[PDB]
Amino acid sequence: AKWNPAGARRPVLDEAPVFYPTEEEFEDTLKYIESIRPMAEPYGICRIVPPSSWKPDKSIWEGSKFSTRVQKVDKLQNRKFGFEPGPEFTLQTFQKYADDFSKQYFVPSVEDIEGEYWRIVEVPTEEIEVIYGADLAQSGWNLNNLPRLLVPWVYVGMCFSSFCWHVEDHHLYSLNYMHWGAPKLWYGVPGKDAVNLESAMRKHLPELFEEQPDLLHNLVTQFSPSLLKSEGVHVYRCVQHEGEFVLTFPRAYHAGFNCGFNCAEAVNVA
Ligand SMILES: O=C(O)CCC(=O)C(=O)O
Ligand SMILES: [Fe+3]
């Protein structure tokens, strides 16, 4: 359908911490991580901007194919059993599709998009669907090297495509790098608040748990940070741009969505 600027329901949240490692600190991923852990841990999420040094093909772009899942954004939180399959794309074709979706729906700022996104999930006025592809030097920052010192997965997102609330498989971290494209909005909740979040969800969305007692492992439910906040849950926003990492901590709840066509890669680790 279309944007509705005056119906924006943008969450009012504290920012998660940002880290600007120096070239030295940056030569050992695992170590730098341990080093920021004490200050970042209490937020459950943090963002990491690589130093100037750090730098990260036509026929992959044009040729390599992947499949997608369909998401009904208006039904991620409010509904009376998830993401059906969608068409096959290439990056090239996905982008043309993604860009057109946005151009028609709306150039908005991130807060414009964020305000609309939560409007769509908290108070939708129209069905709205969206597609995404998921699970497709020398240093651990090149995520293919980290299992060494579990494998890296790739994610193609578009405006409004979502990763719904969850905690990583075990007590695992996850490290996420944004290769190219539009910003990814993240919401993070500290490990010590896992209880408050699940109980907040059970409280407000009782019906669902009834009919899917295992919601929390299904990755199929978005839940407003404003509602979390009302219940005393600490939620920290962060905005990941192209070329940046987002670090997720053990037992830390996290969710978000994309502000447009983008491509990102993530791995778990302890
Ligand atoms: O962005 C996604 O679709 C995946 C989210 C996730 O599970 C993670 O990497 O922490
Ligand atoms: Fe995750």
Short mmCIF file of C-alpha atoms and ligand atoms in Angstrom, two decimals:
data_model
loop_
_atom_site.label_atom_id
_atom_site.label_comp_id
_atom_site.label_asym_id
_atom_site.label_seq_id
_atom_site.Cartn_x
_atom_site.Cartn_y
_atom_site.Cartn_z
CA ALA A 1 0.00 0.00 0.00
CA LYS A 2 1.50 3.29 1.15
CA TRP A 3 3.45 5.11 3.87
CA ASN A 4 1.66 7.03 6.65
CA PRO A 5 4.07 9.57 8.24
CA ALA A 6 1.67 10.81 10.90
CA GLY A 7 0.91 7.28 12.16
CA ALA A 8 4.59 6.60 12.90
CA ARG A 9 5.09 4.52 16.04
CA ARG A 10 8.84 4.87 16.45
CA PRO A 11 10.32 3.32 19.58
CA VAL A 12 11.99 5.76 21.95
CA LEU A 13 15.05 3.83 23.10
CA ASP A 14 18.60 4.15 24.32
CA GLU A 15 21.33 3.52 21.79
CA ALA A 16 23.45 0.38 22.15
CA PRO A 17 27.15 1.05 22.58
CA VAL A 18 29.37 1.66 19.57
CA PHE A 19 32.99 0.59 19.40
CA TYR A 20 35.69 2.07 17.24
CA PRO A 21 38.64 -0.34 17.51
CA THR A 22 42.10 0.87 16.52
CA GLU A 23 44.20 -1.00 13.96
CA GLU A 24 46.11 -2.76 16.71
CA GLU A 25 43.02 -3.96 18.61
CA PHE A 26 41.56 -4.99 15.27
CA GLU A 27 44.19 -7.60 14.45
CA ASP A 28 42.65 -10.08 16.88
CA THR A 29 38.89 -10.44 16.67
CA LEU A 30 38.46 -12.88 19.55
CA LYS A 31 40.64 -10.73 21.81
CA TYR A 32 39.06 -7.41 21.00
CA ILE A 33 35.77 -9.10 21.67
CA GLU A 34 36.82 -10.27 25.09
CA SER A 35 38.13 -6.80 25.76
CA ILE A 36 34.87 -4.93 25.02
CA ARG A 37 32.79 -7.63 26.67
CA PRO A 38 32.65 -6.06 30.11
CA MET A 39 31.28 -2.76 28.86
CA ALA A 40 29.10 -4.18 26.06
CA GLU A 41 27.73 -7.24 27.86
CA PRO A 42 25.22 -5.26 29.91
CA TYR A 43 23.45 -4.16 26.69
CA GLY A 44 23.23 -7.58 25.05
CA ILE A 45 24.22 -5.97 21.76
CA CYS A 46 26.83 -3.62 20.43
CA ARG A 47 28.00 -2.18 17.15
CA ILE A 48 31.57 -2.23 15.92
CA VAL A 49 32.96 0.12 13.29
CA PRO A 50 36.18 -1.15 11.66
CA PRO A 51 39.20 1.20 11.38
CA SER A 52 40.20 2.98 8.16
CA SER A 53 42.73 0.31 7.26
CA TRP A 54 40.14 -2.42 7.11
CA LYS A 55 38.77 -3.04 3.67
CA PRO A 56 36.41 -5.95 3.01
CA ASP A 57 31.67 -9.68 -9.13
CA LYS A 58 29.47 -9.75 -12.24
CA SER A 59 28.11 -13.29 -12.51
CA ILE A 60 27.58 -13.81 -8.86
CA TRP A 61 25.55 -10.64 -8.86
CA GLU A 62 24.01 -11.68 -12.16
CA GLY A 63 24.17 -15.45 -11.97
CA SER A 64 24.16 -16.99 -8.50
CA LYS A 65 20.64 -17.82 -7.44
CA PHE A 66 18.93 -18.07 -4.08
CA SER A 67 15.40 -18.60 -2.78
CA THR A 68 13.31 -16.45 -0.48
CA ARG A 69 10.64 -16.59 2.15
CA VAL A 70 7.59 -14.37 2.29
CA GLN A 71 6.75 -12.31 5.37
CA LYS A 72 3.42 -10.75 6.17
CA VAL A 73 4.68 -7.74 8.12
CA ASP A 74 1.18 -6.79 9.33
CA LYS A 75 0.90 -10.21 10.99
CA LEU A 76 4.25 -10.52 12.84
CA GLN A 77 2.88 -9.50 16.25
CA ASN A 78 -0.90 -9.33 15.86
CA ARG A 79 -2.63 -12.47 14.54
CA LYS A 80 -5.33 -14.96 15.57
CA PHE A 81 2.33 -20.92 10.43
CA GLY A 82 5.11 -18.53 9.41
CA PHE A 83 7.13 -17.78 6.31
CA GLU A 84 5.99 -19.51 3.16
CA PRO A 85 8.44 -19.94 0.30
CA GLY A 86 8.85 -17.22 -2.29
CA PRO A 87 10.34 -16.86 -5.78
CA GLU A 88 13.93 -17.47 -6.74
CA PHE A 89 16.13 -14.46 -7.40
CA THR A 90 19.59 -13.26 -8.15
CA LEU A 91 21.01 -10.26 -6.34
CA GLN A 92 20.44 -8.23 -9.48
CA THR A 93 16.78 -9.17 -9.78
CA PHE A 94 16.11 -9.08 -6.02
CA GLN A 95 17.44 -5.52 -5.99
CA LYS A 96 15.23 -4.34 -8.81
CA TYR A 97 12.27 -5.88 -7.00
CA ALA A 98 13.32 -4.50 -3.63
CA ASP A 99 13.98 -0.97 -4.87
CA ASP A 100 10.63 -0.82 -6.61
CA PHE A 101 8.77 -1.97 -3.56
CA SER A 102 10.28 0.93 -1.58
CA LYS A 103 9.98 3.54 -4.26
CA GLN A 104 6.25 2.85 -4.47
CA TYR A 105 5.55 2.40 -0.77
CA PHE A 106 7.05 5.82 0.02
CA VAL A 107 13.54 9.01 0.00
CA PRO A 108 12.71 8.38 3.70
CA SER A 109 15.19 8.52 6.59
CA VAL A 110 15.89 5.49 8.79
CA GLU A 111 13.61 6.94 11.46
CA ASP A 112 10.97 7.47 8.81
CA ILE A 113 11.25 3.80 7.88
CA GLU A 114 11.48 2.67 11.53
CA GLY A 115 8.38 4.65 12.49
CA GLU A 116 6.45 3.14 9.61
CA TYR A 117 7.76 -0.37 10.28
CA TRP A 118 6.37 -0.45 13.83
CA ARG A 119 3.21 1.21 12.66
CA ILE A 120 2.77 -1.75 10.34
CA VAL A 121 3.32 -4.31 13.06
CA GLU A 122 1.50 -2.59 15.96
CA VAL A 123 -1.39 -1.03 14.08
CA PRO A 124 -1.55 -2.23 10.49
CA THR A 125 -4.12 -0.69 8.17
CA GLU A 126 -3.35 -2.84 5.11
CA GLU A 127 -1.78 -6.22 4.31
CA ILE A 128 1.87 -5.79 3.45
CA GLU A 129 4.22 -8.49 2.33
CA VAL A 130 7.92 -8.67 1.81
CA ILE A 131 10.56 -11.16 0.80
CA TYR A 132 13.99 -12.15 2.02
CA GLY A 133 16.69 -14.71 1.42
CA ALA A 134 18.10 -16.33 4.53
CA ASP A 135 20.70 -18.98 5.40
CA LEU A 136 22.37 -18.84 2.00
CA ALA A 137 42.76 -11.27 6.50
CA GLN A 138 43.36 -13.69 7.94
CA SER A 139 41.52 -12.20 10.92
CA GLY A 140 38.25 -13.42 12.41
CA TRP A 141 36.49 -10.36 10.98
CA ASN A 142 36.44 -12.34 7.77
CA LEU A 143 33.77 -14.55 9.19
CA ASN A 144 34.84 -17.60 7.20
CA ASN A 145 37.89 -17.85 9.50
CA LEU A 146 36.15 -17.69 12.86
CA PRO A 147 34.91 -21.27 13.30
CA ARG A 148 38.65 -22.08 13.27
CA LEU A 149 40.06 -19.83 15.97
CA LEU A 150 29.36 -23.67 12.78
CA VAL A 151 29.75 -21.82 9.52
CA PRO A 152 28.98 -18.30 8.17
CA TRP A 153 25.44 -17.74 6.81
CA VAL A 154 24.28 -15.13 4.29
CA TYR A 155 21.19 -12.90 4.38
CA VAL A 156 19.53 -10.83 1.69
CA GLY A 157 17.08 -8.32 3.00
CA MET A 158 14.77 -5.64 1.70
CA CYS A 159 12.81 -2.82 3.27
CA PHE A 160 10.72 -4.21 6.16
CA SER A 161 12.07 -7.78 5.95
CA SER A 162 12.57 -8.94 9.52
CA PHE A 163 14.48 -11.19 11.87
CA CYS A 164 12.08 -11.73 14.76
CA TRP A 165 12.93 -11.97 18.46
CA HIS A 166 15.21 -14.81 19.56
CA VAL A 167 18.32 -15.97 21.42
CA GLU A 168 21.22 -17.71 19.69
CA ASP A 169 21.30 -21.52 19.68
CA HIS A 170 23.37 -22.14 22.80
CA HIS A 171 25.12 -19.51 24.84
CA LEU A 172 26.61 -18.42 21.57
CA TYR A 173 27.45 -14.95 20.41
CA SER A 174 26.81 -14.07 16.81
CA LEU A 175 28.95 -11.71 14.76
CA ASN A 176 27.26 -9.88 11.87
CA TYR A 177 28.82 -7.98 9.02
CA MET A 178 26.98 -5.88 6.50
CA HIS A 179 28.51 -6.32 3.07
CA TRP A 180 26.49 -3.81 1.14
CA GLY A 181 23.21 -1.95 0.99
CA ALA A 182 20.66 -0.22 3.18
CA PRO A 183 20.91 0.02 7.00
CA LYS A 184 19.82 -2.78 9.31
CA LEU A 185 18.01 -1.75 12.52
CA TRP A 186 18.73 -3.94 15.56
CA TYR A 187 17.05 -4.27 18.92
CA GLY A 188 18.90 -5.86 21.80
CA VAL A 189 18.03 -7.01 25.30
CA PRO A 190 20.70 -8.02 27.90
CA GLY A 191 20.98 -11.67 28.97
CA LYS A 192 19.87 -10.78 32.49
CA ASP A 193 16.61 -9.54 30.99
CA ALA A 194 15.68 -12.68 29.06
CA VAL A 195 13.11 -13.46 31.78
CA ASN A 196 11.43 -10.07 31.59
CA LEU A 197 11.12 -10.33 27.80
CA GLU A 198 9.63 -13.85 27.66
CA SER A 199 7.30 -13.07 30.52
CA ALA A 200 6.35 -9.78 28.83
CA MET A 201 5.51 -11.70 25.65
CA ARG A 202 3.56 -14.45 27.42
CA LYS A 203 1.60 -11.76 29.25
CA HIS A 204 0.58 -9.73 26.20
CA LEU A 205 0.40 -12.46 23.56
CA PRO A 206 -1.10 -15.30 25.61
CA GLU A 207 -3.29 -16.68 22.78
CA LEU A 208 -0.28 -17.54 20.58
CA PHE A 209 1.74 -19.47 23.17
CA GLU A 210 -1.45 -21.37 23.70
CA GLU A 211 -1.54 -22.35 20.03
CA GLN A 212 2.26 -22.50 19.59
CA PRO A 213 3.70 -23.12 23.05
CA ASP A 214 7.16 -22.97 21.44
CA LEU A 215 6.94 -19.50 19.86
CA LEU A 216 10.28 -18.42 21.25
CA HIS A 217 12.18 -20.96 19.11
CA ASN A 218 10.18 -20.39 15.94
CA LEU A 219 11.53 -16.98 14.79
CA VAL A 220 8.09 -15.93 13.63
CA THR A 221 7.02 -13.21 16.07
CA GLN A 222 8.01 -9.55 16.22
CA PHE A 223 7.22 -7.72 19.42
CA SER A 224 7.25 -3.99 19.87
CA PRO A 225 10.16 -2.48 21.88
CA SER A 226 7.65 0.08 23.19
CA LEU A 227 5.66 -2.75 24.75
CA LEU A 228 8.83 -4.31 26.11
CA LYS A 229 9.76 -0.95 27.63
CA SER A 230 6.30 -0.60 29.24
CA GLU A 231 7.01 -3.81 31.14
CA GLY A 232 10.40 -2.66 32.41
CA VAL A 233 12.46 -4.47 29.78
CA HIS A 234 15.65 -2.71 28.64
CA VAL A 235 15.84 -2.58 24.84
CA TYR A 236 18.77 -1.01 22.99
CA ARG A 237 18.55 0.18 19.46
CA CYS A 238 21.30 -0.03 17.00
CA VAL A 239 21.76 0.99 13.39
CA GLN A 240 24.14 -1.06 11.32
CA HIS A 241 25.35 0.48 8.08
CA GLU A 242 27.32 -1.04 5.27
CA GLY A 243 30.81 -2.05 6.41
CA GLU A 244 29.99 -2.43 10.11
CA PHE A 245 29.67 -5.29 12.56
CA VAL A 246 26.96 -5.93 15.06
CA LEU A 247 27.84 -8.17 17.97
CA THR A 248 25.26 -10.21 19.80
CA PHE A 249 26.01 -11.52 23.30
CA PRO A 250 25.27 -14.93 24.89
CA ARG A 251 21.65 -15.23 26.04
CA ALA A 252 20.92 -11.79 24.57
CA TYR A 253 17.53 -11.38 22.86
CA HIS A 254 17.65 -9.59 19.48
CA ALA A 255 15.35 -8.73 16.57
CA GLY A 256 15.21 -6.12 13.82
CA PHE A 257 14.46 -5.34 10.19
CA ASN A 258 16.09 -3.89 7.08
CA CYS A 259 15.65 -0.39 5.69
CA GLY A 260 16.10 -1.55 2.13
CA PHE A 261 17.97 -3.93 -0.08
CA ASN A 262 21.06 -5.21 1.66
CA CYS A 263 23.36 -8.16 1.99
CA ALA A 264 24.92 -9.39 5.19
CA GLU A 265 26.77 -12.36 6.66
CA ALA A 266 26.75 -13.79 10.21
CA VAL A 267 28.42 -16.54 12.28
CA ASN A 268 27.97 -17.88 15.78
CA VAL A 269 30.81 -18.25 18.27
CA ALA A 270 31.65 -18.56 21.97
O1 LIG B 1 19.44 -11.34 9.91
C1 LIG B 1 18.95 -12.51 10.01
O2 LIG B 1 18.01 -12.89 9.24
C2 LIG B 1 19.49 -13.46 11.05
C3 LIG B 1 19.52 -13.06 12.49
C4 LIG B 1 20.33 -13.94 13.39
O3 LIG B 1 19.87 -15.01 13.79
C5 LIG B 1 21.70 -13.54 13.79
O4 LIG B 1 22.62 -13.55 12.92
O5 LIG B 1 21.95 -13.19 14.98
FE FE B 2 20.17 -14.06 15.67
#
